[PDB]
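$ run holo --ligand "potassium ion" --emit tokens
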Amino acid sequence: KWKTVVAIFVVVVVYLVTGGLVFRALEQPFESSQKNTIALEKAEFLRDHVCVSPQELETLIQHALDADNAGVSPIGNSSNNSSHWDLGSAFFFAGTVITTIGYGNIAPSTEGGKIFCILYAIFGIPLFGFLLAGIGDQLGTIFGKSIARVEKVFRKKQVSQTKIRVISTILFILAGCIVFVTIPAVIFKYIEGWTALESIYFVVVTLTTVGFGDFVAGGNAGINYREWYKPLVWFWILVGLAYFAAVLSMIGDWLRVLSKK
Amino acid sequence: KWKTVVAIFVVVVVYLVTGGLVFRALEQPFESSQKNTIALEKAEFLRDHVCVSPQELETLIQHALDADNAGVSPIGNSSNNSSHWDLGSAFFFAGTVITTIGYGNIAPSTEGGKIFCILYAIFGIPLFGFLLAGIGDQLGTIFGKSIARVEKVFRKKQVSQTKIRVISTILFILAGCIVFVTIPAVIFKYIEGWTALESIYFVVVTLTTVGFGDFVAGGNAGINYREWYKPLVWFWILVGLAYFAAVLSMIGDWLRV
Ligand SMILES: [K+]
Ligand SMILES: [K+]
Ligand SMILES: [K+]
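-- output --
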């Protein structure tokens, strides 16, 4: 019904205003802190290095940013050996577009690169949708057979179909939270050398297809990653996304029969 | 069948290898160009400014990047008046997480900010799913009633149901391409001050929920945006996403029958 659609809309607008106030309270003090630190460090550099003019400083900072925007770190000369568009990294970038994660640590700079990216997303995102619905249907049948087995057991125990379906879904959600969320975060903690939080934050930001790109697997210039690392990460992204898609498909299929009745 | 699932997988792996080689050919020459330019400009700064040590330079460049990562432009001090976490911009950030766009121009820096963001996405993304399916079902009924009206008219004209349905869907797709793709891109071109391509690229990357963050509406520290701009951008994202979801649902309902 539309009456409940407007109800969902009010809850969402309230949730965004709430979220907004919480994010402000948590991040604005640090944002205002870094605002002051940069202003101090720049004014400090100019007073410590008299031979540098304020405009000469601005020109360099601009050059540093211009390079960083293109995906080239303006730190060190030895870093000019590792590419972001090599077959391997270009494969993982292509997959980043197709999964709608769109990390953002690297993006097309060329006009043609942007043109191709528009067309690559337009046809590629539905192509992945088919693969995800493919694995989603296969896993959904396995979920359906598993729930049917539990349904026959708890039917004798005098338990409602909705109560069985709800508890089963929580269990499937928890199963994926260990296998595809907890276990890989622990692996990223040791491999990438991130904190316990940064690792879980990365996995959540990844598997939700939010993809901030403030944390990317196989992104460190310092860490000497193995050849199988980046393909294993995208493979985990594929199995992980398909698992939570198969659970979401299962919930959606039940709600469609609920709307019909 | 599982045999047909492996078939799609090969097409996807081929598509990624294809896409990868094209992106390489388009971006690697520029990436290698900028690699050389920064190496020259830095070495140039040190030879032009003898009083600056190579490490003293690295320390400053690091400070400039550290600020940029936190969402503070290391260009000018007057820019330190425009916030990224003010109620309006914080509402838009909240809205970016929920829609799974996650731009990446700005992200939570605080440990607590990251903790809240994990929980905010866990409950917020399904909450949006319901709203998108909600508007998707309501608009889908309107699009079903519209096509049924046209179907009764052209049935007497001896036109097949598939031919009517196909032409109608193309028209609904084209309608959204003007209202939610063309018209907003033209608005962002004038407001944000982007090129014709950059604005269409933004609208496409935004609506496909890819969200690279290399372009974001209401992201410029220099541009003095209106109070209504940042939320309206998200409301366009809401109406736009729901419209194309409702068209996709309509095609999906026909394929099931
Ligand atoms: K997404
Ligand atoms: K995204
Ligand atoms: K993103």
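-- notes --
The first helix of chain A runs from residue 2 to 48.
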